[PDB]
Design a protein around this ligand. Sequence first.
Ligand SMILES: Nc1ncnc2c1ncn2[C@@H]1O[C@H](COP(=O)(O)OP(=O)(O)OP(O)(O)=S)[C@@H](O)[C@H]1O
Ligand SMILES: [Mg+2]
Length: 408
Amino acid sequence: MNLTELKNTPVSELITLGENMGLENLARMRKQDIIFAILKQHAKSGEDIFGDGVLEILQDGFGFLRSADSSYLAGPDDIYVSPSQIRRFNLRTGDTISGKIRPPKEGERYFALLKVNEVNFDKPENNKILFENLTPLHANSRLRMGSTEDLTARVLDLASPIGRGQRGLIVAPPKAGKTMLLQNIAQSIAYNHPDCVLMVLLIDERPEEVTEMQRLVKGEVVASTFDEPASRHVQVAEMVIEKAKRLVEHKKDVIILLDSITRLARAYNTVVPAVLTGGVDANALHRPKRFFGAARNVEEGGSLTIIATALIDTGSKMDEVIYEEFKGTGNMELHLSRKIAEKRVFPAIDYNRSGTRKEELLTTQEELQKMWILRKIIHPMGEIDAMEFLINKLAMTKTNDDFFEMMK
Ligand SMILES: Nc1ncnc2c1ncn2[C@@H]1O[C@H](COP(=O)(O)OP(=O)(O)OP(O)(O)=S)[C@@H](O)[C@H]1O
Ligand SMILES: [Mg+2]
């Protein structure tokens, strides 16, 4: 009846509730392999099979529909779309095509697309692409974040005020709390602004840390693992950013929580050839600069906001040079010191140097004069002790009267 079901359903409910259709031996069949053998048996005799996925136009002329569940990996369970179907409808990589599918004829090998119900959560009626929309400022609306899973969200709203559509960069050494900071920020998105679309992207990630991430975040989670080829990392990032573009064309506010822009740039460097000072090829950091460069604040309606992690102190010469490039391109900085976290103080934020560009119109009027002086009294603090001056007064009330009573 549906494809959105079979791809996500338990892996063993296919040999229990699908084998009873009369199949030979599903001993060593991959997840997507069996789903193909079930659809190519359910549809053969009078049915109404639905189908959905995200479009990826290849190079020749056609483009398949890929599963967001499989991190956009390609298998037998992909819906084929004819070049002629990319003609009548103005199709661009990143479109969510939902419609009635059909079994292969004789030699097609890929389930083809027939009827097209909704193109990007809407009937085929087309508008203004991202490359045409004006880009005035990151600051229009703000996304603000005495419990426990709010104490790190508290210093986030004080150090680096996030905006509804903003280029964000988190600079953190390994083991400072970055892979756990994203699952902290993502939590406070569906707990404050559930209207926003959420996509978490993890490039060159650890397998067991992917599962922890997807079973904790309220939204879409796509990732690549450190065993997958350099070309694979490119695809997932090329799929997420192109899809998020299609939604922003539809006035929708999208947020991307990218992890490892360095490991993403390290991927592009490996694929894009052709002049390499510091390990990285000079004419290669163009592609990852474009990814991060898309995060804007559309005037015509919409919001693209990427907050990516720029890894430092990896030891590798390459990862060091990648940050040197992005240093100031983003208009939001959130540092994590590997000395505050060293002494088991884990909200390890270098508050002193974590400001945002043009934060004057990102907040309420009566908020700046206190925020600056609140830092002017934290300027001569330091490292470990600095995160003890703004954690004790923070442990009391919410955010407002945090510095009201105690001001001797
Ligand atoms: N918000 C937080 N609250 C409490 N503890 C935290 C927080 N963030 C990080 N930590 C602690 O700091 C450690 C950091 O581990 P992770 O959550 O994996 O972060 P990480 O810096 O990305 O680690 P790596 O470099 O990927 S192995 C964990 O053992 C946590 O106990
Ligand atoms: Mg990690």
